[PDB]
Ligand SMILES: CN1[C@@H]2CC[C@H]1C[C@@H](OC(=O)[C@H](CO)c1ccccc1)C2
Ligand SMILES: O=C(O)CNC(=O)C(=O)O
Ligand code: NA
Ligand code: NI
């Protein structure tokens with residue numbers, strides 16, 4: 001029950017109530033009957049299976065200056081293969097690119113092999129964004145904000161991170177606003193902070209896992225939780241997951257949503273530049289919320 005599964009074809013008010021409770025209590029939930037075509041979800045996963053099976057000489061096309069990219073600024077939207085962290089038996093290869101707006105220069109950075117990549121992944125990205133914006137509107141209703149509150153610079157960046165985890169038999173907040181993750185194998189765990197317990201997020205191949213980022217934790221003034229989650233390498237399979245990470249542009253200023261502040265809900269963060277946060281978030285792993293620690297105020 002600590003990972004709620006929310007049916008998006010229930011009554012609207014029940015959806016709002018269930019999403020709001022999940023956001024307050026956990027910061028992570030799954031959605032089913034969510035309106036994204038299952039056929040397209042299957043096709044996207046098949047595209048990534050094909051992509052990660054390509055020979056090394058194809059992979060080199062995504063290695064800037066001959067080596068994988070790192071998650072560091074500037075974080076370009078053009079498609080690259082990234083590595084992140086070290087684990088010994090890379091433990092994670094990620095193909096990442098922006099998706100929105102889909103400028104010609106951005107699209108022409110995407111893979112051309114496998115040949116269906118651009119058609120499938122463009123359609124997938126449009127559908128996942130539409131679902132994300134629906135979820136953000138349910139969140140607006142739960143917070144008491146007008147519909148469309150997040151339909152601006154706060155959602156300007158849509159990074160697709162397709163992750164490949166080589167098998168081996170022997171945690172973070174996402175820094176952005178909100179993430180949708182498609183998975184088909186065990187490996188994702190969520191931290192239940194109140195119980196200091198890591199628990200599995202059941203793989204439902206036709207669902208999306210929704211997790212709130214550190215930006216939404218700040219903007220909600222901690223009325224919502226951000227999700228701290230981690231991945232366990234599979235002992236048998238090479239696991240692939242598909243994340244759509246939506247959030248602000250690098251030129252944005254972030255602060256607790258001003259309309260929700262009150263005498264009993266004073267701001268817990270001062271305004272900060274997203275780019276400055278992003279540098280710390282990507283560099284400083286000393287604590288899960290290191291990226292926002294410099295901006296905390298009104299602590300008691
Ligand atoms: C597992 N890691 C974590 C989460 C995904 C992956 C890569 C990195 O996160 C990002 O690169 C995202 C891209 O939007 C980001 C970058 C700067 C600011 C806010 C968010 C850290
Ligand atoms: O791959 C997964 O199951 C989870 N991925 C992430 O949390 C991430 O890339 O930020
Ligand atoms: Na393997
Ligand atoms: Ni994550």
Ligand SMILES: [Sr+2]
Nearest residue numbers: 034035036037
């Ligand atoms: Sr539909």
